[PDB]
RNA sequence: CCCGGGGGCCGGGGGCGAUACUGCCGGGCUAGGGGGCGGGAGAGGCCGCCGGUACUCCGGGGGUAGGGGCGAAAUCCGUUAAU
């Protein structure tokens, strides 16, 4: 039998965070961040960091019962970057190799339907 | 240079003529303008009510120990449970 769940990915430009939950999302089976499996701060948003963090979390997911999951990839949406960072693709690649059965893949980046004033003033982030 | 004569010295007033244009008075028009009627267009304004995601914070549940940020860090947030 297949027990289903959700692989939530947070792929910003500074890290990557993979929490695996049940279908309702109320219960977390595994959660690994990039810095949790990476030697230094500079290597957190690397795809290599995601690929280790992806396989490390999914290994716990299989050990704790979960055997098939969907993937919901996201970036920091709204007043930030509206697409997943440079580690989300590597994260899902290690997910497929981990033995999990893959369901649907969705982008759930929170899109503002207008917005709020974002940082960095008005001249820009180099002036 | 002096003498003689004509003109001008840009104007004022008088009389007699013309009425093309301007002016005034009278009559009449609709071409400029304004006032209308009809169906539509418009982030035009003021007021009232409602919504959409996003965000931040607060309360509770899951789960450990990182998160955040950078060129790289650090400050900072986090073991009174964070992301
Ligand atoms: Mg500034
Ligand atoms: Mg003379
Ligand atoms: Mg004289």
Swiss-Prot record:
Alphabetic keyword roster: Ribonucleoprotein, Ribosomal protein, RNA-binding, rRNA-binding
One Pfam family linked to the record: Ribosomal_S11
Keyword Metal-binding recorded: no
Gene3D superfamilies xref list: Ribosomal protein S11 (3.30.420.80)
Family matches, as NCBIfam families: arch_S11P (TIGR03628), PRK09607.1 (NF007176)
Similarity section: Belongs to the universal ribosomal protein uS11 family.
General function of this protein: Located on the platform of the 30S subunit.
Protein name as catalogued: Small ribosomal subunit protein uS11
Organism field: Pyrobaculum calidifontis (strain DSM 21063 / JCM 11548 / VA1)
Encoding gene (name): rps11
